Amino acid sequence: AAQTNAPWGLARISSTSPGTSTYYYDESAGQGSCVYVIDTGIEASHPEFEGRAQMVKTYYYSSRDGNGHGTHCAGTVGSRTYGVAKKTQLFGVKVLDDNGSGQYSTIIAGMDFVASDKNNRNCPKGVVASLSLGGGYSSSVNSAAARLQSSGVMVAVAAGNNNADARNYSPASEPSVCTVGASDRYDRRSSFSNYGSVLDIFGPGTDILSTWIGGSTRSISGTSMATPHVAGLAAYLMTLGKTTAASACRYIADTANKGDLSNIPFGTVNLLAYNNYQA
């Protein structure tokens, strides 16, 4: 398949080079996989989701996304126009309030929720979780992310937007998950992206067009936007049978574009997510 005039980030994850605008992908498009978006919720009624999105848990008085961030992330995972994995099922877990903040105890509960709830869903090709959130180091937050990964979910987490070493942020610093940095359309590390040895991979994170609340769309930037590209790529590759949840991060790193990015400090991987699709 070929989607012309795609968002630059989709085009980038199907290309060996910057500067193209078509997204190429296998038509299976993540069918039979599931992605949990652990964030501010998802506006499931958005037509871009085509009935494939639903809210499954909230820790607040409503399951509505009153912020937009979670809807934007879900759109990059799996919306029809803006998504990597255009046929995946999307499950929203609202651990962040409508101001975009959440207590660590609530975030931990949401991760343990996903580890159990996957047994209540039909995801024969595999289960992914996209965690576009983060704060200071907490061993409890890291151990919750580690447990989720151990349960058989591919966990993708944002490196954080502090232009600092991700070792000092959670769940970014948990070694066993897939920690995602952000790049821009000219293959530079995004100026805000955290870095360090704990990073596994970079994805597109600057000026990312996706869905928003009110049935709308907008471009925004962050490692939060890079993370759902990687989560959607994992869902896509699972459906193709190329990898499993336990192996997906290593598979993505093994098949990534190498050495493309500038401004990677020594000790941090120089790797940009790539779907290796050949039509």
| Binding residue positions for Ca(2+) | 16, 175, 177, 200, 260
- Count, residues near Ca ion per rule CB under 5 A: 1
245 contacts Ca ion (rule: CB under 5 A): no
Determine the residue with CB nearest Ca ion. 200
Task: Specify whether the CB–CB gap between 121 and 114 falls below 8 A.
Answer: no
| Residue 20 beta carbon to Ca ion: minimum distance, rounded to whole angstroms | 29
Q: Is 73 or 199 the residue whose CB approaches Ca ion more closely?
A: 199
Whole-Å CA distances, 243 to 60, 85, 227, 236, 253: 35, 15, 18, 10, 12
| Residue 225 beta carbon to Ca ion: minimum distance, rounded to whole angstroms | 19
Q: Is 173 or 190 the residue whose CB approaches Ca ion more closely?
A: 173
252 contacts Ca ion (rule: CB under 5 A): no
- Name which of 164, 167, 106, 171 is nearest 135 in CA terms: 171
Has 224 been annotated as catalytic? yes
- Name which of 79, 104, 99 is nearest 211 in CA terms: 79
Catalytic residue among 15, 33, 39, 210: 39
Chain positions 163 to 202 lying near Ca ion, rule: CB under 5 A, are: 200
The answer for residues whose C-beta is within 8 angstroms of residue 9's C-beta and 6 or more apart is 76, 185, 203, 204, 205, 208, 225, 229
Whole-angstrom distance, CA of residue 3 vs CA of residue 29? 12
- Name which of 78, 77, 34 is nearest 56 in CA terms: 34
260 contacts Ca ion (rule: CB under 5 A): no
| Residue 145 beta carbon to Ca ion: minimum distance, rounded to whole angstroms | 10
Q: Where are the alpha helices (DSSP H) in 118-170?
A: 139-150
- Show binding-site residues: 16, 175, 177, 200, 260
Task: Specify whether the CB–CB gap between 45 and 25 falls below 8 A.
Answer: no
Q: Is 35 or 145 the residue whose CB approaches Ca ion more closely?
A: 145
Find out whether the peptide bond into 171 is cis, omega within 30 degrees of 0: yes
Has 46 been annotated as catalytic? no
| Residue 183 beta carbon to Ca ion: minimum distance, rounded to whole angstroms | 18
Catalytic residue among 14, 15, 46, 69: 69
Has 176 been annotated as catalytic? no
Residues known to be catalytic: 39, 69, 224
List of residues contacting Ca ion (CB under 5 A): 200
